[PDB]
């Protein structure tokens, strides 16, 4: 198999809205995503998720709930991205725009799927139904899925 690198992804999901961040600069600018990044040496995955949420958005949370895991493979990249997906409904501060990321709330009947990673159209709906999931997606570039698997699970 390939080697994998650990990443986190955090969805701030409230009863009627979700907070996403727009990538502001460079290639892939204009895409909305949850918050997250690479797990660092020595921290648990959940603590890495909390850290990235705070570094990227300004928000803190006491805890997160793990809701899924998704492996991404990109043609021409030998390393897989192993993305651990968390939610929370409970926040206590305001999101902050940076030079790299603009946060915005979306109502849950206005989820901006066409401007999100294409895989989100498949797994986001499960997250909204309080389901847990495991997924895998192989991409050619940023837009085209060549192969994928997705399964609801009882335990992540
Ligand atoms: N296909 C996809 N679908 C999705 O919903 N999120 C994806 C995705 N592919 C990547 N991501 C998320 C995972 C993770 O939160 C982020 C990628 O991590 P980054 O490159 O942002 O890591 P870092 O912030 O550690 O890197 P730097 O800021 O460049 O140091 O994008
Ligand atoms: Na980051
Ligand atoms: Na990082
Ligand atoms: Na990031």
From Swiss-Prot:
Residues the record lists as binding Mg(2+) 2: 52, 55
Binding site for O(6)-methyl-dGMP: 8, 23, 33, 117-120
Coiled coil: none
InterPro entries (alphabetical): 8ODP, Nudix_hydrolase, NUDIX_hydrolase-like_dom_sf, NUDIX_hydrolase_CS, NUDIX_hydrolase_dom
EC number(s) stated in the UniProt entry for this protein: 3.6.1.56, 3.6.1.-
Residues that, per the record, bind 8-oxo-ATP: 27, 35-38, 52, 56, 117-120
Outcome reported for the amino acid change (mutating residue 156 to A): Slightly reduces 2-oxo-dATPase and 8-oxo-dGTPase activities and increases thermolability
Entry note: cofactor: Binds 2 Mg(2+) ion per subunit.
Swiss-Prot/TrEMBL keywords: Cytoplasm, Hydrolase, Magnesium, Metal-binding, Mitochondrion, Nucleus, RNA-binding, Transit peptide
Pfam families registered for this protein in UniProt: NUDIX
Domain Nudix hydrolase: 3-132
Residues engaged in binding Mg(2+) 1: 36, 56, 100
GO molecular function terms listed in the Swiss-Prot or TrEMBL record: 2-hydroxy-ATP hydrolase activity; 2-hydroxy-dATP hydrolase activity; 8-oxo-7,8-dihydrodeoxyguanosine triphosphate pyrophosphatase activity; 8-oxo-7,8-dihydroguanosine triphosphate pyrophosphatase activity; ATP diphosphatase activity; dATP diphosphatase activity; hydrolase activity, acting on acid anhydrides, in phosphorus-containing anhydrides; metal ion binding
UniProt binding sites for 2-oxo-dATP: 8, 33, 35-38, 117-120
Gene3D superfamilies, alphabetized: Nucleoside Triphosphate Pyrophosphohydrolase
Tissue specificity comment: Widely expressed with highest expression in thymus, testis, embryo and proliferating blood lymphocytes.
Principal EC category: hydrolase
Chain residues that bind 8-oxo-dGMP: 8, 23, 33, 117-120
Activity dependence on pH, as recorded: Optimum pH is 7.8-8.2 with 8-oxo-dGTP as substrate, and 8.0-8.5 with 2-oxo-dATP as substrate.
Record keyword Magnesium present: yes
Entry binding sites for N(6)-methyl-AMP: 8, 23, 117-120
Needed cofactors: Mg(2+)
Ranges spanned by the short sequence motif Nudix box, renumbered to the chain: 37-58
Subunit and interaction comment: Monomer.
Job of this protein: Oxidized purine nucleoside triphosphate hydrolase which is a prominent sanitizer of the oxidized nucleotide pool. Catalyzes the hydrolysis of 2-oxo-dATP (2-hydroxy-dATP) into 2-oxo-dAMP. Also has a significant hydrolase activity toward 2-oxo-ATP, 8-oxo-dGTP and 8-oxo-dATP. Through the hydrolysis of oxidized purine nucleoside triphosphates, prevents their incorporation into DNA and the subsequent transversions A:T to C:G and G:C to T:A. Also catalyzes the hydrolysis of methylated purine nucleoside triphosphate preventing their integration into DNA.
Protein name (Swiss-Prot/TrEMBL): Oxidized purine nucleoside triphosphate hydrolase
Organism, as annotated: Homo sapiens (Human)
Lineage of the organism: Eukaryota, Metazoa, Chordata, Craniata, Vertebrata
């Amino acid at each position: 198999m390939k080697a994998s690198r650990l990443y986190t992804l955090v969805l701030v999901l409230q009863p009627q809205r979700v907070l996403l961040g727009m990538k502001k600069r460079g290639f892939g600018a204009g895409r909305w995503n949850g918050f997250g990044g690479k797990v660092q040496e020595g921290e648990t995955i959940e603590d890495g998720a909390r850290r990235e949420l705070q570094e990227e958005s300004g928000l803190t949370v006491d805890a997160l709930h793990k809701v899924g895991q998704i492996v991404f493979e990109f043609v021409g990249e030998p390393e897989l991205m192993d993305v651990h997906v968390f939610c929370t409904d409970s926040i206590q501060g305001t999101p902050v725009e940076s030079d790299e990321m603009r946060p915005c709330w979306f109502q849950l009947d206005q989820i901006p799927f066409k401007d999100m990673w294409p895989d989100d159209s498949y797994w986001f709906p499960l997250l909204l139904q309080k389901k847990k999931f495991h997924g895998y997606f192989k991409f050619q570039g940023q837009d085209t899925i060549l192969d994928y698997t997705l399964r609801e699970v009882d335990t992540v």
